[PDB]
Design a protein around this ligand. Structure first.
Ligand SMILES: Cc1nc(NC(=O)N2CCC[C@H]2C(N)=O)sc1-c1ccnc(C(C)(C)C(F)(F)F)c1
Lengths: 276, 977
């Protein structure tokens, strides 16, 4: 009584590429599964995709002489009989190192019911509304990203320019040290015999040095202010994108889901892209 | 005309005026006479014993020993100069500035890095540099000659049978130009010689017609030399002339006149080279991998929008989890602190050597029904084993990376390891369980013994063959993997089955792996095309990657290594450590062959803007530039040349993006006219082809192309004496703004396709012109002379579908007209098959351009596959042909009934043969695309994208179905346009 048609089974997903199975089995608990036609397209193979150990194990179903099974002794009369048997029997019987059961089938209806308003007239308007939002979101997202990446460059250039200011300040400071040690007392002070060279020459030089070091020190501080303000703005742009991105993901799924189940399956049209 | 300040060693400051082009010597000499008029001039000394110093834009405390440099080259941060006593090795310091200028970052930076792995690489690689530098000098001056001018030969001595028929009894008519007259008078001879004669016999026979050998043959025009003893038909220049039926021109030069130019190069071991208990094997430890997540320094998320956040981790081994992922409790956004012991089920003794740890910070949105919305905020991997075979332990801090935009997944197992070099990013403190000592991965001695402890004909050899011939990306089922592993001992008889037999091994069990090691140690060597597949992200084991390189070294020819250079560079990023067998192999090659080295350098240099690999490529570039030899001066001249272009181009974008083109062109001509730029853009080798050298710039021809990005058109006179025989000009497009990595891959694939078609017997003549990306969205495009876009022809000839045919007939009218149409067909056929297999779309009358001899080629690839269908989803994939009425009219010689002309059928038949020909070699094209996954191309990020090729080639179906599948495509687009 429990052996129904495979076509009407809620986990047999029909013809889907290996790629399409992957997004549906993404980050799912061990035991998630679904069935589909073999990639070869020779009907009568029905590869089984079983999620175990974070991996998508990919098992094959054989159909020799109108029977089914995993190994050579095919002892099942149909896939639904085979799938149902292992929905309560652990696969360890088939393989000791595959201790799982088919627990969480990826029902085709369970997710398909998410879409509503099957009427094509409503879908045409509903789909167009989501596309305009999605396109606006992507346009807005790109605007921030370029600014975010561009602002990253200005930060890096600013940060390095600070280091160049560190070296220039350090270089000047060492010179002030040598000047005072050498020419402050050893030569001129010993020559303190009424000569005005110290008053004019040495003092005029030293003051000019001091005004130079301070001016460089001042420019570094003014630069640090821009970096601090830029760094904070750099973080803010990160927050805007970190919130925009998750929202933009959901629209993509919803717009696609309508197209898969309303605009293509319900009514096959070349007008599909005309709604947009 | 620039005010400067000099800090004399007597604690003085002197203001001075300088000429922006003034050299250091003139300034140093000029300065001191100014110092005599200051209070403490007596303690001053002569000019000698003093050198200048300043800070560069790169913020380096650089002392300029090489005084000959001038002010503009200085790139000083501010106009201040300090004078001190020169200290240290003057020659060593001068070289370091040369290296730093080439690789774009000061060499002193690598000195600061405290990571022991970085330092060990710097001094351990040098033994590779020494061996190469000694090998080039084994037999001077001969050996040094081949390094500089390596033979540009092909890997196959035997000509294809279709081309051997272009030689009457295999006789080649080669013209030899001897220039011996003192008044530069050129003499030409004509020779008819066998195709298999070595160049010396060509020289030996050449003299007698004029009436060791003392002479060498050079390619007239482009300075490529026939040095090695190879059949004259094997050299790429000679082979090409046969194909094009042109007359090959060569000139005779004396070995002395060439050996003289080769300057002796000395490689000195740098300064850093001289500078400089209880261990438990992994298998003894008995526990489960547990990792503690302490806290995240700071995450940039909004409290209102994000409900909670958590850290998601997994033990990946080359892209596949070794066990179930784990998550941390969801803590509030405002306070990111966890302090939890994540616990994994991977027993410690079973950790594979190449095991990693991928982790991320994801934000749970929820807030609607039961639909959790997860969006990762950062990511970062770390190897669980030290580059010395040591398992990380103790506390750790990690700076995470921005999520690769376009990546919706919650982990990035393919991203590069290590912390984010930037420090203002989310830092996640970890803490690895300490096992009372240092834990080392067991050595091969113990591993082999363990395998021995834990360790019949068959009729089903067909199944092994069936699997081994499958696609690299073909579905592999659990029953097969169990089948393959169960028959591992019999897989040697099919050595190309190794890539499949490796996937069937469960890397999370040391009993399995220990046996795969004892087996890989004896695997029969495999073709280099198959071994290149063992180097992409799917195979991280050191012993597997070590085997692939041993295959590369003893089977990869210098010609093939040049073709697959882009791919081999990329698979460097998949290496977990800095010092690996692949880099030693690649560097050993780049240092014994300047042709490989030139592109080895430029490929790494173009990817220095990417901080993910900036460090490991920068270290590699330094080790190369240190031992490249006399070439470094040539590279610096190129680098300095491109920089002037980039700066000039930028001024026309951020400053002159609005005014009229005439103003732009007039402004451009002035900028080119300045001598400072004028001398930088002259007399340097062309980056696209080192064998070409660019002479004087032609200001009257260089112009701003009016394309989308407004690229730059540059004309350089060929300085060679015999430039007339070969092209007399180099025209290059400099493009700043459009990524050119896709075009390089597209053009590299076309070249590989055409090679396969030639061997098959179809003379489908592709034209894969030269494209090189030098930096970030900046690159050079070679220009094909005497060719026009289809749009130009229609506009110039103005409409009707026959306009293209009329133009082509006029350009070559007479008996040649048959030759043109055949070349148009053969070329047009090749591009229809190629633009379909790779899914290049947007092809229109502006990126299809056709020469005067009838040949047709495609330009402006950019996007490939169906990226334009990924973004704006269009459900099912695939693209139609571009065969238009115009092409059909030309193919069928203008017949009114184009569709079913007699010659059209040969066109379709040869399209079929082309399609099948590529399909049989789909393994190669799959591996080439897979190795480029980490390159960061937006169109190529996951095996999902490469799966598009598996459709167009109909790899899953059978040969008959594929062909019939293809014919459906041709017919659909044929009558559809
Ligand atoms: C290989 C090549 N040859 C060109 N032009 C001539 O060969 N000739 C020959 C005579 C003058 C000129 C002409 N069109 O009459 S353009 C070109 C090319 C290659 C690749 N991309 C491009 C563009 C337009 C996308 C870019 F990048 F430049 F903007 C151009």
């Amino acid at each position: 009584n429990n052996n129904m048609s495979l076509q009407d089974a809620e986990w047999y997903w029909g013809d889907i590429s290996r790629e399409e199975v992957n997004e549906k089995l993404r980050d799912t608990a061990d035991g998630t599964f679904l069935v589909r036609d073999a990639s070869t397209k020779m009907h009568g193979d029905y590869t089984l995709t079983l999620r175990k150990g974070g991996n998508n194990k990919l098992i094959k179903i054989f159909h020799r002489d109108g029977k089914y099974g995993f190994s050579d002794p095919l002892t099942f009369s149909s896939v639904v009989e085979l799938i149902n048997h292992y929905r309560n029997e652990s696969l360890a019987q088939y393989n000791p190192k595959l201790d799982v059961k088919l627990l969480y089938p990826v029902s085709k209806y369970q997710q398909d019911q998410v879409v509503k308003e099957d009427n094509i007239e409503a879908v045409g308007k509903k789909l167009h509304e989501y596309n305009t939002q999605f396109q606006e979101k992507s346009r807005e997202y790109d605007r921030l990203y370029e600014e975010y990446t561009r602002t990253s460059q200005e930060i890096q250039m600013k940060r390095t320019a600070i280091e160049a200011f560190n070296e220039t300040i350090k270089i000047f400071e060492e010179q002030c040290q040598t000047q005072e040690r050498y020419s402050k007392e050893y030569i001129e002070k010993f020559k303190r015999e009424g000569n005005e060279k110290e008053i004019q020459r040495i003092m005029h030089n030293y003051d000019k040095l001091k005004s130079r070091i301070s001016e460089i020190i001042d420019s570094r501080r003014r630069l640090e202010e821009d970096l601090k303000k830029q760094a904070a703005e750099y973080r803010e742009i990160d927050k805007r994108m970190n919130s925009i991105k998750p929202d933009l993901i959901q629209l993509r799924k919803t717009r696609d889901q309508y197209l898969m189940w309303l605009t293509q399956k319900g009514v096959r049209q070349k007008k599909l892209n005309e709604w947009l | 005309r620039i005010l400067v300040e000099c800090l004399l060693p007597n604690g003085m400051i002197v203001t001075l005026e300088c000429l922006r082009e003034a050299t250091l010597i003139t300034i140093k000499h000029e300065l001191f006479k100014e110092a005599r008029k200051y209070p403490l001039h007596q303690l001053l000394q002569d000019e000698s014993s003093y050198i200048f110093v300043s800070v560069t834009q790169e913020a380096e405390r650089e002392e300029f020993f090489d005084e000959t440099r001038r002010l503009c080259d200085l790139r000083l941060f501010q106009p201040f100069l300090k004078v001190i006593e020169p200290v240290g090795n003057r020659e060593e310091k001068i070289l370091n500035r040369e290296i730093g200028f080439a690789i774009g970052m000061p060499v002193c930076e690598f000195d600061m890095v405290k990571d022991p792995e970085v330092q060990d690489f710097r001094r351990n690689i040098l033994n590779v540099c020494k061996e190469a530098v000694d090998l080039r000098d084994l037999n001077s001056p001969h050996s040094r000659a081949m390094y500089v001018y390596p033979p540009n030969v092909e890997s196959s001595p035997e000509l294809p049978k279709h081309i051997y028929n272009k030689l009457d009894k295999g006789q080649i008519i080669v013209v030899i130009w001897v220039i011996v007259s003192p008044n530069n008078d050129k003499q030409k001879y004509t020779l008819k010689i066998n195709h298999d004669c070595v160049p010396e016999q060509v020289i030996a026979e050449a003299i007698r017609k004029k009436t060791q050998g003392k002479y060498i043959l050079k390619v007239c025009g482009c300075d490529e030399y026939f040095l090695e003893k190879y059949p004259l038909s094997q050299y790429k220049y000679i082979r090409s002339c046969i194909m094009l039926g042109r007359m090959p021109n060569l000139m005779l030069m004396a070995k002395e006149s060439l050996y003289s130019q080769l300057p002796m190069d000395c490689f000195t071991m740098p300064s850093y080279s001289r500078r400089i208990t209880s261990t438990k094997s992994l298998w003894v430890i008995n526990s489960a991998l547990r990792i503690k997540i302490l806290c995240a320094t700071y995450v940039n998320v909004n409290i209102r929008d994000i409900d909670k956040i958590y850290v998601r981790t997994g033990i990946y081994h080359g892209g596949e989890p070794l066990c179930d992922n784990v998550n941390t409790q969801r803590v509030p956004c405002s306070n990111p602190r966890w302090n939890e012991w994540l616990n994994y089920d991977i027993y410690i003794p079973d950790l594979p050597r190449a095991a990693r740890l991928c982790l991320s910070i994801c934000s749970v949105k929820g807030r609607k029904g039961a639909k959790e919305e997860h969006c990762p905020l950062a990511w970062g991997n770390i190897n669980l084993f030290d580059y010395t075979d040591t398992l990380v332990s103790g506390k750790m801090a990690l700076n995470l990376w921005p999520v690769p935009h376009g990546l919706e997944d919650l982990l990035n197992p393919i991203g590069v390891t290590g912390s984010n070099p930037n420090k203002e990013t989310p830092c996640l403190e970890l803490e690895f369980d300490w096992f009372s000592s240092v834990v080392k991965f067991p050595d091969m001695s113990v591993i082999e013994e363990h395998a021995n402890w834990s360790v019949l004909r068959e009729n089903d050899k067909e199944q092994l063959k069936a699997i081994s011939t499958r696609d690299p990306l073909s579905e592999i089922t659990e029953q097969e993997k169990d089948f393959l592993w169960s028959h591992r001992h019999y897989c040697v008889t099919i050595p190309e089955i190794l890539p499949k037999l490796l996937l069937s091994v469960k890397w999370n069990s040391r009993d399995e792996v220990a046996q795969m090691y004892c087996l890989v140690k004896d695997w029969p060597p495999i073709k280099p095309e198959q071994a290149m597949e063992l180097l992409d992200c799917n195979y991280p084991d050191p012993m597997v990657r070590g085997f692939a390189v041993r295959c590369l070294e003893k089977y990869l020819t210098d010609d093939k290594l040049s073709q697959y250079l882009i791919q081999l560079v990329q698979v460097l990023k998949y290496e977990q450590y800095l010092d690996n067998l692949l880099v030693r192999f690649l560097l050993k090659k780049a240092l014994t062959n300047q042709r490989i080295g030139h592109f080895f350098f430029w490929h790494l240099k173009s990817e220095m803007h990417n901080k993910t690999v900036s460090q490991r490529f920068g270290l590699l570039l330094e080790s190369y530039c240190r031992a490249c030899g006399m070439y470094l001066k040539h590279l610096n001249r190129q680098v300095e040349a491109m920089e002037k272009l980039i700066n000039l181009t930028d001024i026309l974008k951020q400053e002159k993006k609005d005014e009229t083109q005439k103003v732009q062109m007039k402004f451009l001509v002035e900028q080119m006219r300045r001598p400072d730029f004028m001398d930088a853009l002259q007399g340097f080798l062309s980056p696209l082809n080192p064998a070409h050298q660019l002479g004087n710039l032609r200001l009257e021809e260089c112009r701003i192309m009016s394309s989308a990005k407004r690229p730059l058109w540059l004309n350089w006179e060929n300085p060679d004496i015999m430039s007339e025989l070969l092209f007399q000009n180099n025209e290059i497009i400099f493009k700043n703004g459009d990524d050119l990595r896709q075009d390089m891959l597209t053009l590299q694939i076309i070249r590989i396709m055409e090679n396969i078609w030639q061997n098959q017997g179809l003379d489908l003549r592709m034209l894969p012109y030269g494209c090189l990306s030098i930096g970030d969205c900046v690159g050079l495009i070679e220009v094909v002379r005497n060719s026009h876009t289809i749009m130009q022809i229609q506009c110039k000839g103005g409409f009707n579908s026959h306009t293209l045919h009329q133009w082509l007939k006029d350009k070559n009218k007479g008996e040649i007209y048959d030759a043109a149409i055949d070349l148009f067909t053969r070329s047009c056929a090749g591009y229809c098959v190629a633009t379909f297999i790779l899914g290049i779309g947007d092809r229109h009358n502006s990126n299809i351009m056709v020469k005067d001899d009838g040949q047709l080629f495609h330009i402006d690839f950019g996007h490939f596959l169906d990226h334009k269908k990924k973004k704006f989803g269009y459900k099912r994939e695939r693209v139609p042909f571009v065969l238009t009425q115009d092409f059909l009219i030309v193919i069928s010689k203008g017949a009114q009934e184009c569709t079913k002309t007699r010659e059209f059928e040969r066109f379709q038949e040869m399209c079929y043969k082309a399609y099948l020909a590529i399909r049989q070699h789909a393994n190669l094209f799959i591996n080439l695309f897979s190795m480029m996954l980490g390159s960061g191309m937006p169109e190529l990020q996951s095996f999902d994208d490469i799966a598009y090729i598996r459709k167009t080639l109909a790899l899953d179906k059978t040969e008959q179905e594929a062909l019939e599948y293809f014919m459906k495509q041709m017919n659909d687009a044929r009558h559809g346009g």
